[model samples]
Target chain A: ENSTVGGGGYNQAKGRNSTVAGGYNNEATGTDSTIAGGRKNQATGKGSFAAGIDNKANADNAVALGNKNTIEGENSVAIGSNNTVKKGQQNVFILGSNTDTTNAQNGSVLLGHNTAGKAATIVNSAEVGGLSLTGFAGASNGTVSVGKKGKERQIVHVGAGEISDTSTDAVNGSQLHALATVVAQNKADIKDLDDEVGLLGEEINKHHHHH
Target chain B: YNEATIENSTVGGGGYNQAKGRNSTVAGGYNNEATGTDSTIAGGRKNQATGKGSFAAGIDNKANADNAVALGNKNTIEGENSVAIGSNNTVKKGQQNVFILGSNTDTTNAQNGSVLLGHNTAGKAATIVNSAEVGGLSLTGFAGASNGTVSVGKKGKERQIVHVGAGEISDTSTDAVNGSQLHALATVVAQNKADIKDLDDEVGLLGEEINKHHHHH
Candidate 1:
């Protein structure tokens, strides 16, 4: 005879020692999956377990057993701590070697942009290599870092504008005003001479025409 | 120089006094008669005969004044043409009835007498009176009232002090001031035109920077 059991907030079936824990709002219609903790976390696909504080292990045959860990992609298992499998792309393993390696935290690793964390054999877009042994307080590459470095060495070259005229002109404004006044006076005297010449030509024309 | 003819003579006793100016004669030494001449003096070192016709009484005394007589070393007559009887005193040169009988008695003219004498210190009188005096102290104007006066001559520069006046009002009057304001505004506009030209030059330089940035990126 087959058996079917139902409750007011959930449905359960017995396949010998099968259980569903509480603190969940779920509709788990798949077989052999467990979500131990974390609010609103689901282990919907078959043969999956979520043991993180608040994370999801949503693919088939996957396990996120560590705290704040996730195994959302298919055919992957993270055993060495709080790892993440970002969605899309096949066989993504952070902080570890790939599948077929035991516990997946093996020799091969890849570090991303400007990151120095993890014991890795390879990295991409890295600004620094090797772990910092003495910490960041008093360690620097002199002129390469921002603060707290050694003293500087200096070299000086004269500016191009100063090289042409080394001495600056520093005459007083009153003297310049007097100089401009003298120039204007000389121009006025020249204009008076031109006016006298024009008047002399007018008198000579009157004498030649009718005198 | 003895030409006396003994025309007439009269003598008396009591140390033989003589009137020096008009009715004067001298007796002989020690109460003897030497009339029709000056008075006679006693024969001693302190007796004298003085006056217009008096004889030396002795080494120190005199018959002083118009009709007086002296007997000792400090006796003198009391009137004009007087005699002194001390070693250093006088019956003063122009006095009346003033007999000096002691050595070193004052013979200077008194304040209310025929001559008035006041003490004068040793300095140039002209320079002392012409001194500047602002108070009762004797300065350069100390000698007299008729000395000289100090004045601001063509080159007087005792004090370099000066009096300030109002500054010059410029020839730029109200209309000229408005024109100056317009001129300043025009100058600012011209400067701003040059500033914008510089700003365009900076923009050209910034264009080269942007091109470099894009090429490097």
Candidate 2:
């Protein structure tokens, strides 16, 4: 039963138990999808939902709950204005009414403007000297960096290979582990060179004494 | 809207709010429980404050570890002496982990310490140590970036303004120059100046020899 109703508006509910609850030019074309009053909103995926203007929930079990937001992944959610969850599973993209990065990667969470990145989850750890380390480093994959304002930037490379051998900035446990490994190897090599030099010195001394 | 289940515990307002631990308080919300000694849950649905001296507020929040605080909806703070504030924030395990004012979730153990401020959304992937404070929109400060230095703001936008006495202005790390680096650079500049002075003296001596030779000619 199509229970969608609106005056001077175009509404469609073409699936069983789908609803377009009073909106202008809205669509609820998926099974059990719902659009709770929004202009030009689309909930075209199965069990998807959209509740704001110009929003699109285009994948199965997707949800768009703010203005102009788009959720194109299954079980994904895009909340707030102009945020986009592009083609991923179980993604949750959230923002506070702003125009910024348009898309979030698969299985990630994005908050605020410019908070789109590729990660399993993104937690906006609030304020370190008035900066967002998670927001600044969330763009890359698994690379975390932080620093004091007006100081050398400290970086923690997780599977991003070596952060320069001569970096003046601080490092994390993993980087310290790598440094310890190299330092141990260097010590071994130095010991070998020292032993060889000692042996050579002894040989030269014996030859001089015989002469 | 009242339950006297535990001794010296209080459960007031609606729902199945239970005060299960001694001196615990659960003041409203559905299926809420304060199951730790001196714990408190001040409303919201399905919330639990199960740690000693822990506190939880908002819906579906849990303070499972000792002295933990879970504020905001859908949060779980399982670390001792930790805090998780904002929606969907999680601190799985860590001592002294603080997540405030945003949905910054941490699913792993934070060694030593970690703090998140504004809108940072990096989860358990980044474990910060040594009093690292990161929050707001673009601020980044790592622990041990400098010795005993509490850095504020992002890397590209870090500036420290200090008000000295009258007619004096103090700036920290302006133009990428701090006290240490500036002192080193000043030593080099002083050496260069001394070398230039020596060259000028050499030139003066050569000029005097030329004049003497000219007079001899």
Candidate 3:
């Protein structure tokens, strides 16, 4: 009754009272099935019960509780875990590739960046403004509040939130120079905007004139 | 007490206690007397005739300064022609006062003259201050603390929930409650670019708070 089984059975021939344990590699398959363990650890022709891992029984009423843990033949119960039985079936699967590849079939793509590229350029006051001036122009009627009074100071008044007549001669003169340079530099850009407006206006005028 | 006619008065728990001293009566209970002229008394106990043409019926009731009548305990009638049936119900304080008629009359607080039809109702003065109701699971009600002559309703078919101040953090709606309907992602991106352009603007705003959290160690 009290028996432990490991692998293949060992005891054989004339063993009637003793018990068999373990898998096929255990001793005496005729040993009581209550103490067999392991895979192929115990193999028996007589009716025996196994309660451990990996045991096989062939006779009637043979029981095993340890799973394929034990591999049973026929009319036997294996009870530990992983009890699986698969005989007749087939299956197929397909795994695609990564995303970086660029081709015309599976990974087709369209070109976006402009190919006809050119280098950048810069033009200062020399090229932009036709006239060459050093600094800004100050007012005529100037005083110390206007930074050192002048004989011919012009009393100019601007709108609210705008600058009145210039104060310092040097600063005012620089500002005038900057203003003139900016006016001259924007002539080309003004012409481009004017051309676009002119084209749209021409289309409108044609439609109106025809109607 | 047959020639003792009461007129335009209120009466409480006293004899001849008539409000307004005109065409009213009170039954004796305590000071059961018609204090106002042209009023009558029938009961006792702190009775008064305060209003014009008012009367009293029960004990420990008062009517004052109007056409009001009290039938129960500690009732006041100070308005023009008001009445009170239950104890501790006031109606005789203002003009055209009316109280305690047929059916179950209860506590009513009417100030400066008004009328009461049911029980525990503050009738016609300025506004109804407090009220309670029920909802499905959550309590849904109106919360108006200090509203000044304003009404919350709908325009045509479309309804709009408006907040006049920035005190409220968030509002619930499908469209434009908080950033639910605003183009917040684009606006944030645009503002972030502007911040990148002028990084100097916000550099000093958080300085005081950050200074407080500086770990000396």
RMSD of each: 61.7, 17.4, 42.3
Per-residue accuracy of model 2 over A45-135 as CA lDDT, tens digit each = 7656677789997876565777988777654556678766566434344444443333233333344443334322343333333233233
TM-score winner: 2
Candidate 2 chain B lowest-lDDT run of ten: B164-173
lDDT of 2 at A98: 48
Q: How would you encode candidate 3's per-residue C-alpha lDDT over B1-217 as one tens digit per residue? A: 1122333223333333323333233322445555543333345555655433334546665655532446566666565444455656664343332434222332233332222333333332235322322221222222221101111111222112221111111221101111111212223334544654354333333333344534421
Q: Give all candidates' CA lDDT scores.
A: 0.31, 0.51, 0.32
* Estimated TM-score for each candidate: 0.19, 0.36, 0.23
Model 1: residue A80 alpha-carbon error in angstroms: 7.2
Can you tell me which runs of candidate 2 are displaced by over 4 Å? A1-211, B94-101, B107-109, B123-217
Candidate 3 docks at the CAPRI level of: incorrect
Instruction: List per-model TM-scores for chain B.
Output: 0.30, 0.57, 0.39
Which ten residues in a row are the worst by lDDT in model 1 chain A? A140-149
Candidate 2 chain A worst ten-residue window by lDDT: A139-148
Best DockQ among the predictions, by candidate number: 2
